[PDB]
């Protein structure tokens, strides 16, 4: 009664992948990085190119660290919308994609060769965000400390918005 993709989501406890992030508008400026996610609701997005940014996320908040600025911006989250939460919520659609809606934003996951392949949603400006995964790993061992925002030094301005 579970498809192969449905079993992956049921059994999933961690995930890592390289990603390409495209936002559709004037000219596609494409961001590249690495994603690590882990139960219960932890996620880390490391952008490597062309800008370096680290986005730590859990159930309660998101931390956006901009090393070029020596600044971290913290936003409390009212809805659980981290990557692992979304996956554990997806339901299979008639077209074979997977979807879920959280706070009026619909997220669409497509699989390929048995692994998460792409994630698509509108941002809060109604712009379409497409994230494509490569070198995807199902249930890798990801050490917990990777997820701890450790400045590490203390030049960092902490901005709350």
Numbering used by the authors: 24 to 184
The authors write:
After X-ray diffraction data were collected, the structure of LolA-HP was determined with molecular replacement using a search model obtained from AlphaFold. The structure was refined to 2.05 Å with final Rwork and Rfree values of 20.2 and 25.2%, respectively. Similar to other LolA structures, LolA-HP comprises a curved antiparallel β-sheet that consists of 12 strands. The last strand, β12, links to β11 through an elongated segment that extends along the outwardly curved surface of the β-sheet. The concave side of the sheet forms a hydrophobic cleft, shielded from the adjacent solvent by the presence of a helix (α2) and an extended loop region between β6 and α2. The base of this cleft is formed by the N-terminal helix, α1. In LolA-EC and other studied LolA structures, there is an additional helix that protects the cleft, which is equivalent to the extended β6α3 loop in LolA-HP. In LolA-HP there is a proline (P99) at the end of β6 that precedes the extended region, but no other prolines are present in the segment that fills the cleft. In LolA-HP, this motif is replaced by an Ala-Pro motif (Ala62, Pro63), and the space that would be occupied by the arginine side chain in LolA-EC is instead filled by a phenylalanine side chain (Phe107) on the α3-helix. Structural comparisons showed that LolA-HP has a deeper hydrophobic cleft but lacks the negative electrostatic potential critical for binding polymyxins.
In Gram-negative bacteria, the localization of lipoprotein (Lol) system facilitates the transport of these proteins from the inner membrane to the outer membrane. In Helicobacter pylori, an ε-proteobacterium, lipoprotein transport differs significantly from the canonical and well-studied system in Escherichia coli, particularly due to the absence of LolB and the use of a LolF homodimer instead of the LolCE heterodimer. This study presents the crystal structure of the H. pylori lipoprotein chaperone LolA (LolA-HP) and its interaction with lipopeptide antibiotics such as polymyxin B and colistin. Specifically, H. pylori lacks the LolB receptor protein at the OM and, instead of the LolCE dimer at the IM utilizes a homodimeric LolF, which combines the functions of LolC and LolE.
